[PDB]
Amino acid sequence: IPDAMIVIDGHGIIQLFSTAAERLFGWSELEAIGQNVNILMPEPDRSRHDSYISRYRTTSDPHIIGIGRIVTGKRRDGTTFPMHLSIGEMQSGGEPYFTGFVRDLT
Amino acid sequence: IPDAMIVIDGHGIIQLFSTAAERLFGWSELEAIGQNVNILMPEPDRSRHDSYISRYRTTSDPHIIGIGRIVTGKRRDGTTFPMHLSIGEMQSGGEPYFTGFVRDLT
Ligand code: HEM
Ligand code: HEM
Ligand SMILES: [Cl-]
Secondary structure (H helix, E strand, O other): OOOEEEEEEOOOEEEEEOHHHHHHHOOOHHHHOOOEHHHHOOOOHHHHHHHHHHHHHHHOOOOOOOOOEEEEEEOOOOOEEEEEEEEEEEEEOOEEEEEEEEEEOO | OOOEEEEEEOOOEEEEEOHHHHHHHOOOHHHHOOOEHHHHOOOOHHHHHHHHHHHHHHHOOOOOOOOOEEEEEEOOOOOEEEEEEEEEEEEEOOEEEEEEEEEEOO
């Protein structure tokens, strides 16, 4: 069974939500697509997350991309869990997309 | 954004296989994982595909990465189809992975 996988666009909007992401986070892919990825985390990260993406696009200075971090995730039901996050960047049709891989540490 | 997404490791081994990829290629994620991505393409690309990955790891000079290409995919039943392929490079746990988006052009 693989880890959860999520794809966002350059403004943090979820574009793809894997089957393992559905199970872990509780949202169906249809529900998750079109929402900001910030729904998947507690405060204060949630309020700050757009700024993290914007800063990266401005500076190209990675903090988690290619680096990884243990962080706290938040499920649809409101409960939280420890998770490892890896992130990649790619271009498709001239626009940036970020792919995140989420390992449930519980 | 194409709906079909495939993730491979630095040796071409499938790590993740999204639901649209499963539908398009006719393989379960549970079955695709651990197989070489070369199962998804006809010859001659199939038997050259490892060399493409290894040459990229050597040179860091993209061919398809960041650019895209129309290529031929192969379903489990042997039938083929035109597809647009987009690819990005990423790192997780200090190892390279490749994120591929597949657009069926049928
Ligand atoms: C769901 C739990 C998540 C948490 C708690 C979280 C938290 C964070 C934090 C704290 C940063 C800033 C790092 C720093 O400046 O110290 C960050 C950056 C970023 N995150 Fe999230 N994130 C989560 C999920 C995701 C996912 C799933 C993606 C991609 C699909 C993603 C994409 C990004 C991007 C593109 C950046 C900016 C690049 C970078 O700083 O390396 N995040 N995230
Ligand atoms: C299934 C249909 C596919 C076909 C027919 C195909 C074919 C090719 C071709 C023709 C090249 C360029 C060879 C050259 O430079 O001479 C290539 C390179 C490459 N492909 Fe595949 N590919 C397919 C799927 C994928 C997928 C899904 C991924 C990733 C998940 C992937 C990862 C790579 C990588 C990492 C390279 C080398 C880097 C680059 O070209 O920039 N391929 N592939
Ligand atoms: Cl990582």
